[PDB]
Amino acid sequence: PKKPKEPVQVPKLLIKGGVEVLEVKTGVDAITEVECFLNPEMGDPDENLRGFSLKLSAENDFSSDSPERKMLPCYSTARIPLPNLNEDLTCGNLLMWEAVTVQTEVIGITSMLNLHAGSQKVHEHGGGKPIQGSNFHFFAVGGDPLEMQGVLMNYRTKYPDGTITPKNPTAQSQVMNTDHKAYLDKNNAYPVECWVPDPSRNENTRYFGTFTGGENVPPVLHVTNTATTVLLDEQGVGPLCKADSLYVSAADICGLFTNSSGTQQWRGLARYFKIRLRKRSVKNPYPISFLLSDLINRRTQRVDGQPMYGMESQVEEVRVFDGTERLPGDPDMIRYIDKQGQLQTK
Amino acid sequence: LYVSAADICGLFTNSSGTQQWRGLARYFKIRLRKRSVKNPYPISFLLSDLIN
């Protein structure tokens, strides 16, 4: 009996399991894979009807429009801790966790086929109406929280107080405005109709999203566990994790669902992720005089002196003697440095 | 150096029968010395705390 052909080398599994697996001492070329889902927070009108919105307000004033908090979709957010790379690099190099490859896939797509779920009757003796209308899908992977832009419409609407809205809207806020920024740090309070990602600031995340508005369009879903969405930039780095944290934020609205009396309401589903990780060799950016800067300022007493910084200074004149030279036939001269060279006026 | 101790040494008894607890002091003696180790936290981990 001849021996078989010798097999093909693959990367070696070392530990599978729960969340307590990340605490393993590995070598340098370690790679991990983290499978995680997020809940959709569509509003939850009671405890019994999880994952929906409440019945919609049909027509209010353009001025006295006052919704309630139980009927707004919101962005779902979460934070994954990571363990330290407590390592031994020379000349101030560090090691931080990079998130190379994402792969998203919507969970629960065939719940919408259930037509006998209390819809309004579509014709004489027919079945139930499926979910159709404006869909929305949005997810984001990065080492920093999703810094997002303020945009709303109809600024004269009075939000309820469970939500976080842009502060002090004007008529100018309905287009690109600067003074309506916020971070994303609180689940089920950031409404979908009031925030979009800021294209200016996020050097560290990657957001993907698409939108289709309509009275009645079919929601198209697409499920495949061989798709692979790449997260590299032009230079070759993904999201770095500055602090040991990994911020994943996502939100999904599938469409409009009609109840038994004929009221449209919203529908959300969950979302799956699979972030692959790796160790990058980065360098230190900040100066050496930083640790001490804070260490002294949390031990020495606070002094309420007579001030010496800013437009209320009481220093008259400062001089910096450095090096030597010949006698200047004028002692009342003034010498300084303009932008790069040594200049001297009268 | 965290030194902690607890001593309960029986039951003193009163005159009308009401018992109550009693304990006493505890001496200690420690013979310290100077032990070598290796640095557990290099300044990298010391640096990451400020960002956090």
Side-chain angles (χ1 to χ4, degrees), chain A residues 209-257:
Chain A
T210 184
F211 174 70
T212 298
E215 182 180 1
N216 41 1
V217 297
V220 178
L221 297 174
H222 192 76
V223 59
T224 295
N225 59 355
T226 63
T228 297
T229 297
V230 184
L231 294 182
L232 296 174
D233 63 354
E234 301 89 6
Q235 301 297 324
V237 290
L240 293 173
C241 299
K242 288 175 68 177
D244 284 335
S245 294
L246 186 62
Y247 298 94
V248 175
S249 296
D252 284 324
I253 293 97
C254 291
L256 298 175
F257 175 77

Side-chain angles (χ1 to χ4, degrees), chain A residues 139-211:
Chain A
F139 71 101
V141 166
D144 295 331
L146 187 62
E147 299 177 354
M148 61 185 62
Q149 174 66 43
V151 168
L152 48 89
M153 68 170 289
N154 193 0
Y155 71 100
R156 294 183 181 277
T157 56
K158 289 86 129 347
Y159 291 94
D161 52 354
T163 57
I164 171 66
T165 67
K167 296 293 189 291
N168 301 119
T170 63
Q172 183 63 39
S173 296
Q174 294 180 358
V175 296
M176 178 62 205
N177 191 355
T178 307
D179 294 331
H180 298 283
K181 303 287 188 181
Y183 281 91
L184 185 70
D185 56 355
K186 188 70 181 295
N187 193 3
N188 200 1
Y190 287 90
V192 294
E193 66 183 5
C194 297
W195 298 97
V196 296
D198 188 5
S200 69
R201 291 177 177 177
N202 291 317
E203 291 92 6
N204 205 5
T205 56
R206 300 289 185 272
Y207 55 84
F208 283 150
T210 184
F211 174 70

Side-chain angles (χ1 to χ4, degrees), chain A residues 17-257:
Chain A
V19 73
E20 295 90 5
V21 174
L22 292 167
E23 219 174 345
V24 166
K25 284 187 180 292
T26 61
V28 177
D29 290 329
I31 51 173
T32 67
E33 288 179 352
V34 175
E35 298 187 359
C36 64
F37 70 97
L38 299 181
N39 288 315
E41 293 290 331
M42 298 304 294
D44 290 333
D46 56 354
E47 76 272 20
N48 301 112
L49 195 60
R50 176 73 172 86
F52 286 165
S53 66
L54 199 140
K55 67 181 179 67
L56 292 172
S57 176
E59 285 178 351
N60 293 116
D61 192 2
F62 194 80
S63 294
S64 72
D65 196 3
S66 178
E68 69 267 18
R69 188 259 190 277
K70 305 296 291 297
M71 60 181 287
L72 299 180
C74 295
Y75 293 89
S76 297
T77 178
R79 96 165 258 118
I80 293 169
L82 292 176
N84 190 11
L85 293 173
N86 193 3
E87 295 290 327
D88 292 332
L89 266 300
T90 184
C91 65
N93 299 121
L94 277 73
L95 297 176
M96 297 188 289
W97 292 105
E98 192 194 14
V100 172
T101 297
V102 73
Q103 178 177 359
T104 185
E105 186 173 1
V106 181
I107 290 170
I109 63 167
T110 65
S111 182
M112 295 164 67
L113 291 172
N114 190 359
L115 295 176
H116 56 282
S119 176
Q120 188 177 3
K121 195 184 287 187
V122 57
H123 60 272
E124 296 292 327
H125 291 171
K129 184 175 181 178
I131 296 168
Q132 66 187 2
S134 299
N135 56 357
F136 185 79
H137 295 288
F138 176 68
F139 71 101
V141 166
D144 295 331
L146 187 62
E147 299 177 354
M148 61 185 62
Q149 174 66 43
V151 168
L152 48 89
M153 68 170 289
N154 193 0
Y155 71 100
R156 294 183 181 277
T157 56
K158 289 86 129 347
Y159 291 94
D161 52 354
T163 57
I164 171 66
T165 67
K167 296 293 189 291
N168 301 119
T170 63
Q172 183 63 39
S173 296
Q174 294 180 358
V175 296
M176 178 62 205
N177 191 355
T178 307
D179 294 331
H180 298 283
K181 303 287 188 181
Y183 281 91
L184 185 70
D185 56 355
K186 188 70 181 295
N187 193 3
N188 200 1
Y190 287 90
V192 294
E193 66 183 5
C194 297
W195 298 97
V196 296
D198 188 5
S200 69
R201 291 177 177 177
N202 291 317
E203 291 92 6
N204 205 5
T205 56
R206 300 289 185 272
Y207 55 84
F208 283 150
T210 184
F211 174 70
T212 298
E215 182 180 1
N216 41 1
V217 297
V220 178
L221 297 174
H222 192 76
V223 59
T224 295
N225 59 355
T226 63
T228 297
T229 297
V230 184
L231 294 182
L232 296 174
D233 63 354
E234 301 89 6
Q235 301 297 324
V237 290
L240 293 173
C241 299
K242 288 175 68 177
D244 284 335
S245 294
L246 186 62
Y247 298 94
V248 175
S249 296
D252 284 324
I253 293 97
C254 291
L256 298 175
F257 175 77

Side-chain angles (χ1 to χ4, degrees), chain B residues 1 5-6 8 11 13-14 19 24 27 32 38 45 49-50:
Chain B
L1 181 65
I8 288 95
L11 295 177
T13 305
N14 293 316
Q19 295 180 357
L24 290 177
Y27 173 79
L32 298 170
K38 188 177 183 179
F45 171 68
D49 201 5
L50 290 173

Side-chain angles (χ1 to χ4, degrees), chain B:
Chain B
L1 181 65
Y2 291 95
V3 171
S4 66
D7 290 325
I8 288 95
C9 294
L11 295 177
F12 180 78
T13 305
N14 293 316
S15 294
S16 294
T18 60
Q19 295 180 357
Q20 66 189 1
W21 297 90
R22 191 182 191 274
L24 290 177
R26 180 168 287 272
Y27 173 79
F28 282 91
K29 175 182 175 181
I30 293 96
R31 184 180 170 87
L32 298 170
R33 69 177 184 178
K34 293 184 182 179
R35 164 67 72 185
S36 176
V37 292
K38 188 177 183 179
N39 194 1
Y41 297 157
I43 65 171
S44 300
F45 171 68
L46 186 56
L47 183 56
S48 295
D49 201 5
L50 290 173
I51 305 169
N52 201 4

